[PDB]
Design a protein around this nucleic acid. Structure first.
Ligand SMILES: [Mg+2]
Ligand SMILES: [Mg+2]
Ligand SMILES: [Mg+2]
Ligand SMILES: [Mg+2]
Ligand SMILES: [Mg+2]
Ligand SMILES: [Mg+2]
Ligand SMILES: [Mg+2]
Ligand SMILES: [Mg+2]
Ligand SMILES: [Mg+2]
Ligand SMILES: [Mg+2]
Ligand SMILES: [Mg+2]
Ligand SMILES: [Mg+2]
Ligand SMILES: [Mg+2]
Ligand SMILES: [Mg+2]
Ligand SMILES: [Mg+2]
Ligand SMILES: [Mg+2]
Ligand SMILES: [Mg+2]
Ligand SMILES: [Mg+2]
Ligand SMILES: [Mg+2]
Ligand SMILES: [Mg+2]
Ligand SMILES: [Mg+2]
Ligand SMILES: [Mg+2]
Ligand SMILES: [Mg+2]
Ligand SMILES: [Mg+2]
Ligand SMILES: [Mg+2]
Ligand SMILES: [Mg+2]
Ligand SMILES: [Mg+2]
Ligand SMILES: [Mg+2]
Ligand SMILES: [Mg+2]
Ligand SMILES: [Mg+2]
Ligand SMILES: [Mg+2]
Ligand SMILES: [Mg+2]
Ligand SMILES: [Mg+2]
Ligand SMILES: [Mg+2]
Ligand SMILES: [Mg+2]
Ligand SMILES: [Mg+2]
Ligand SMILES: [Mg+2]
Ligand SMILES: [Mg+2]
Ligand SMILES: [Mg+2]
Ligand SMILES: [Mg+2]
Ligand SMILES: [Mg+2]
Ligand SMILES: [Mg+2]
Ligand SMILES: [Mg+2]
Ligand SMILES: [Mg+2]
Ligand SMILES: [Mg+2]
Ligand SMILES: [Mg+2]
Ligand SMILES: [Mg+2]
Ligand SMILES: [Mg+2]
Ligand SMILES: [Mg+2]
Ligand SMILES: [Mg+2]
Ligand SMILES: [Mg+2]
Ligand SMILES: [Mg+2]
Ligand SMILES: [Mg+2]
Lengths: 114, 23, 54, 100, 146, 124
RNA sequence: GGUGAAAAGUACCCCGGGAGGGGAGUGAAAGAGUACCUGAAACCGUGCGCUUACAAUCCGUCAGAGCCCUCGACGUGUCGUGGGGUGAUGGCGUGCCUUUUGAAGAAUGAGCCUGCGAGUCAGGGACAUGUCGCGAGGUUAACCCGGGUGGGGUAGCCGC
RNA sequence: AAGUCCAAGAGUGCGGCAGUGAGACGGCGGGGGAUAAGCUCCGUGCGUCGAGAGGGAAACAGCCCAGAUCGCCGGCUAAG
RNA sequence: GGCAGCCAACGUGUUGGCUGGGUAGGGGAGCGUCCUGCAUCCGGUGAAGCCGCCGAGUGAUCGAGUGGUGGAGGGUGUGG
């Protein structure tokens, strides 16, 4: 085991499968490397996930009191959240359904040795 | 009439003894 | 046309797999005496201060 | 040496000490049964003649009574509505062979 | 219970079969027999545990009757009208080896294990082979009387 | 007296789903498709439990034939001679003899050949 | 429709524009946080174990190598009356239901899960058969008296 | 006159509860048709399928063998 | 070697002999759910429900065997 800090972001207005597509870029990396990768990656879902990673780092800053530079994003994933249902009217009186999906991004970072 | 002849004749095998459904 | 059968999990996950992103390749630059990482495309523009390193 | 015992309508290759799961035998555990032989191999010579194969028996001891694996049967025929469920566990005895 | 081979139980022997003036079907049937391992008391249909077979003098195979001109080998290229036929005749001097091996492939099982089994067959049209390092013992086409 | 039929309904569901573990696809996830697969599974188990006794006899015969022909005798003549000699060992243990110790198999082939007619093709 | 016994409904600190969280506290519990009792399945991830890129698979079943876990024994890795997981490979193998002479059928129906959805009830009805009471008899209907399911009620009805 | 007779699970009579009343192919006897049809209509103490699993006929309801109470890592056979 | 249906023998629970494919359909005997009369038992030292483990029964199914979660009601007998 290694000392760990957690951060959760729930009900983020981003599809889970669109959050995972940038989560898969940064899994198992140092926090600073992950933050850089997210900051230059051209998909909008980076904005939530990046924040979540940073939030976790701060917890290890301020609640475990451990070294900034040893942090690695050990576990990160995106669960589905509640879906809102809407209607788009279509041709000849049809009415199709629209899903406004959300996500829960969870990150656990560990202070591994160098 | 190849299909009919060739189906109808496989009744004359040893294991069928000169008989078979649908002749 | 219309899908004849519901498609199986193996075959669904086979081409959901191709929908991925690639991480940009970063290089190091020195701005205001401290080191930052930027794409090699934006290297010059960082070296003369036209990209906002937060 | 090793023999081939006859029991339960089946033949089992046996050497002293081997444990064999055979069909049910009427013998309380601890009792010693004696079983006929279909063949004996001693080193390099075998006993195949019928009269002198009848001269030797294998003596074994009953260790316990066992239930075989649970077998589940579900007979089924399509479009007729016919199902039939049942199960079977076979009764067995464990024999620790002592002498040949 | 019944014997099944473990990991290091299979041992492989190298047989060289001379094909000079032998019937193609007889040679191929025997080669398939001792290529599949049907001559071993440790046979088990699950395991590929046969032997290596070299066929020497695959040129000199004997084909009885009148099959050197009226027996065909058909291949289809998958394209409409993509069927070509070569007699046993043409196939014996264009490149002869496959003739012999063709027969053997038709008497091995047509499953994945048959693909693994094929690799032990080495057919050579000449009277000599490069595998002298494995000491291939000559094999005679024998029949057991009854 | 209204009943909520869910306590009783779920029991067979859990039984069938627990039996359907390892099934590839949705035959291990959905009670209906798993039940359809269980029908085939138990019929196939009956079929193969019956035919296993023939598959194993096939295997024993094949091994015995190979060992016999190594000893230069045909399988059919071998068992004909063993029947003539009164040695009454079944094909299972005869296959264990063929594999484990071939010397006893050789001796038993000797007995079978010694107890066999001077002409197997004689009109008798 | 359902937080908790009681709002005691999270002071203060930290990341974040907020939303959301992490410490700290409240509480018996926060796997009770005003998205709140229990929290199943479908569906969606993440981690580990075995397997899989020369192979024609109603997707199983029977035999089965190798690997992984676990329980015993002797001992110190190899057997055992063993147990699990996964499965290279080999044999066999044409979904379910309706309706049909006959459907794997290229006939119908069914995307999936969870909840729901079809021989019931009334009547001195009719016929038959069990069971019980009384028996050449058997029984009351309306009704009357009983805080009751008890007791009276011969009109009729069936047998003769 | 016997046989079967700890069974055919047989006849016949009365009653309660039925389903069925679209059959198929094969052997033998025939009508219709062109002595055609995997056609159609009858007869048959004829069979199988229907409502039948298992083995053979490559596959193959109706053909040949044989009627599945369950288990066995025993043996003998049938058609082939 | 295990079960069951019909029948027989001694006799009063055994043994023996025959038999046990099956749709429409007929008959018999049962599993699980809920509500209740009466009787007993369990439960904040943790009921139900759910998720497992290890097992059991000829079948529906069972687990007054066990853990995890859970937080207030349940089991069994004999009738309705
Ligand atoms: Mg960004
Ligand atoms: Mg409009
Ligand atoms: Mg729509
Ligand atoms: Mg013509
Ligand atoms: Mg005809
Ligand atoms: Mg059918
Ligand atoms: Mg039908
Ligand atoms: Mg599996
Ligand atoms: Mg506290
Ligand atoms: Mg609690
Ligand atoms: Mg909710
Ligand atoms: Mg809740
Ligand atoms: Mg491969
Ligand atoms: Mg094929
Ligand atoms: Mg397979
Ligand atoms: Mg197959
Ligand atoms: Mg219709
Ligand atoms: Mg129909
Ligand atoms: Mg029709
Ligand atoms: Mg269909
Ligand atoms: Mg289709
Ligand atoms: Mg229709
Ligand atoms: Mg449809
Ligand atoms: Mg409804
Ligand atoms: Mg009524
Ligand atoms: Mg008679
Ligand atoms: Mg009878
Ligand atoms: Mg009758
Ligand atoms: Mg009519
Ligand atoms: Mg009619
Ligand atoms: Mg008719
Ligand atoms: Mg017709
Ligand atoms: Mg006629
Ligand atoms: Mg006519
Ligand atoms: Mg006709
Ligand atoms: Mg007729
Ligand atoms: Mg019908
Ligand atoms: Mg059949
Ligand atoms: Mg019939
Ligand atoms: Mg006949
Ligand atoms: Mg025989
Ligand atoms: Mg014959
Ligand atoms: Mg009996
Ligand atoms: Mg029956
Ligand atoms: Mg029968
Ligand atoms: Mg209950
Ligand atoms: Mg009660
Ligand atoms: Mg109490
Ligand atoms: Mg408490
Ligand atoms: Mg209740
Ligand atoms: Mg507890
Ligand atoms: Mg509990
Ligand atoms: Mg009741």
């Amino acid at each position: 085991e290694f000392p760990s800090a957690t951060a959760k972001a729930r009900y983020v207005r981003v599809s889970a499968t669109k959050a995972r597509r940038v989560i898969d870029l940064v899994r198992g990396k140092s926090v600073e490397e992950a933050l850089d990768i997210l900051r230059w990656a051209p998909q909008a879902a980076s904005e939530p996930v990046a924040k979540v990673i940073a939030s976790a780092a701060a917890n290890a800053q301020n609640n475990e009191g451990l070294d900034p530079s040893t942090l690695v994003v050990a576990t990160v994933y995106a669960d589905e959240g509640p879906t809102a249902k809407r209607i788009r009217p279509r041709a000849q009186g049809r009415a199709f359904r629209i899903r406004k999906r959300t996500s829960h991004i969870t990150v656990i970072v560990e202070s591994r040795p160098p | 009439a190849k299909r009919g002849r060739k189906k109808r004749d496989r009744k004359h095998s040893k294991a069928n003894h000169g008989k078979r459904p649908n002749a | 046309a219309v899908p004849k059968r519901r498609m199986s999990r193996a075959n669904t996950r086979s081409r959901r797999a191709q929908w991925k992103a690639e991480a940009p390749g970063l290089v190091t630059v020195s701005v205001a005496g401290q080191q930052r990482k930027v794409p090699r495309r934006l290297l010059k523009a960082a070296r003369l201060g036209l990209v906002d390193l937060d | 040496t090793y023999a081939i015992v006859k029991t339960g309508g089946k033949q089992y290759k046996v050497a002293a000490g081997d444990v064999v799961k055979v069909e049910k035998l009427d013998s309380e555990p601890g009792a010693s049964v004696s079983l006929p032989v279909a063949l004996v191999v001693d080193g390099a010579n075998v006993t195949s003649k019928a009269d002198d194969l009848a001269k030797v028996a294998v003596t074994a001891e009953v260790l316990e009574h066992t239930k075989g694996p649970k077998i589940r049967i579900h007979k089924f025929k399509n479009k007729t509505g016919y199902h039939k469920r049942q199960g079977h566990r076979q009764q067995l005895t464990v024999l620790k062979v002592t002498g040949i | 219970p019944t014997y099944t081979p473990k990991a290091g139980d299979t041992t492989r022997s190298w047989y060289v079969i001379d094909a000079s003036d032998v019937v193609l079907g007889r040679l191929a049937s025997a080669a398939a027999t001792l290529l599949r391992g049907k001559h071993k008391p440790t046979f088990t249909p699950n395991v590929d545990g046969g032997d290596f077979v070299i066929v020497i003098n695959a040129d000199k195979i004997a084909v009885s009757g009148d099959k050197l001109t009226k027996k065909f080998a058909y291949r289809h290229s998958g394209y409409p009208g993509g069927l070509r036929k070569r007699t046993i005749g043409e196939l014996l001097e264009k490149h002869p080896t496959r003739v012999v091996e063709n027969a053997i492939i038709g008497m091995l099982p047509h499953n994945k294990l048959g693909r693994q089994i094929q690799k032990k067959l080495k057919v050579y049209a000449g009277p000599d082979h490069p595998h002298a390092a494995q000491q291939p013992i000559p094999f005679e086409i024998k029949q057991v009387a009854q | 007296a209204r009943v909520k039929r869910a306590l009783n309904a779920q029991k067979k569901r859990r039984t069938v789903l627990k039996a359907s573990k390892g099934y590839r696809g949705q035959r291990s996830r959905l009670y209906r498709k798993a039940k359809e697969q269980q029908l085939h599974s138990l019929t196939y188990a009956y079929r193969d439990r019956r035919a296993r006794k023939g598959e194993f006899r096939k295997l024993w015969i094949s091994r015995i034939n190979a060992a016999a022909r190594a000893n230069d005798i045909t399988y059919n003549r071998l068992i004909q001679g063993l029947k003539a000699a009164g040695v009454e060992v079944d094909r299972k243990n005869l296959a264990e003899l063929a594999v484990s110790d071939p010397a006893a198999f050789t001796a038993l082939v000797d007995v079978a050949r010694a107890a066999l007619p001077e002409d197997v093709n004689a009109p008798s």
